[PDB]
From TrEMBL:
Domain of life: Viruses
Keywords: ATP-binding, Kinase, Metal-binding, Nucleotide-binding, Transferase
Keyword ATP-binding part of the UniProt annotation: yes
GO molecular function annotations of the record: ATP binding; kinase activity; metal ion binding
GO BP: any one term: inositol phosphate biosynthetic process
Protein name: Kinase
Residues that bind ADP: 7-8, 10-11, 24, 65-67, 78, 183
Residues that, per the record, bind Mg(2+): 183
Organism this protein belongs to: Terrestrivirus sp
Binding-site residues for ATP, renumbered to this chain: 7-8, 10-11, 24, 65-67, 78
Length: 215
């Protein structure tokens, strides 16, 4: 059995028996499975654009697309954009849960951060992308493109996205990047859109835009 190098979270996640698959154990209930199927039926375009592919289920294990699979040197950041169980967000509208090399920067997921500390941790995450300003700018711009479309699409989705994370990935050489929504374990049906989750995404767009333009 090969344990998957999770950047954050608590769930048991292992490499699949075949290439490009991770198996995530549904720890507490099968709600995550119920929610993937609900989104498949009602919001299929959202699922295709923004969520790792669900390949199927093996007992309590979801077979998911490995978002790190096609990367030589992946850098991963987990940002919780849905409501936390009980606590307020560590950066006001969202909580950075972890990132590649965060230990080197004395990152603490329990620490409440100022705007300046929040921006500095995102800058820390980008340092592995090296000194080629142009390439790292293109990574930020590609993230902004997808997050802006996500924020727009969220207005017409009647789900409370409790506990969901954005998984940001870029390669050391900045040749490839993506961002996707994961962790649907606490997601619930509601009669309106989720303004709290939209506010998390628009706040990230503002921060990344500032980084992409700052000389
Ligand atoms: N499809 C995926 N591809 C790659 N890494 C993933 C994927 N889903 C989750 N991860 C990794 O696992 C961590 C936890 O995922 P998440 O679904 O939030 O589970 P948990 O219940 O442990 O919070 C993420 O921070 C990320 O590092
Ligand atoms: Mg999670
Ligand atoms: Mg995809």
């Amino acid at each position: 059995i090969r344990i998957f190098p999770r950047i954050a979270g608590r769930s048991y996640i292992i490499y699949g028996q075949t290439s490009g698959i991770i198996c995530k154990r549904m720890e507490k209930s099968d709600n995550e499975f119920v929610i993937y199927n609900y989104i498949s039926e009602h919001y299929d375009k959202f699922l295709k654009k923004y969520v790792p592919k669900l390949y199927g289920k093996n007992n309590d294990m979801l077979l998911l697309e490995d978002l790190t699979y096609n990367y030589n040197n992946p850098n991963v950041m987990d940002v919780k954009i849905g409501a936390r169980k009980r606590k307020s967000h560590t950066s006001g509208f969202f909580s950075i849960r972890g990132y590649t090399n965060s230990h080197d920067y004395k990152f603490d997921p329990d620490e409440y951060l100022t705007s300046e500390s929040t921006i500095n941790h995102i800058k820390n995450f980008m340092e592995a992308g090296g000194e080629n300003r142009d390439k790292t700018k293109q990574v930020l711009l590609k993230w902004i493109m997808k997050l802006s479309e996500l924020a727009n699409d969220l207005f017409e989705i009647n789900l409370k996205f409790d506990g969901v994370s954005l998984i940001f990935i870029y390669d050391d050489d900045c040749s490839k990047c993506d961002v996707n929504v994961v962790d649907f374990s606490r997601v619930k049906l509601i009669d309106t859109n989720d303004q709290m989750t939209i506010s998390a995404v628009t706040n990230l767009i503002k921060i990344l835009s500032e980084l992409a333009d700052n000389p």
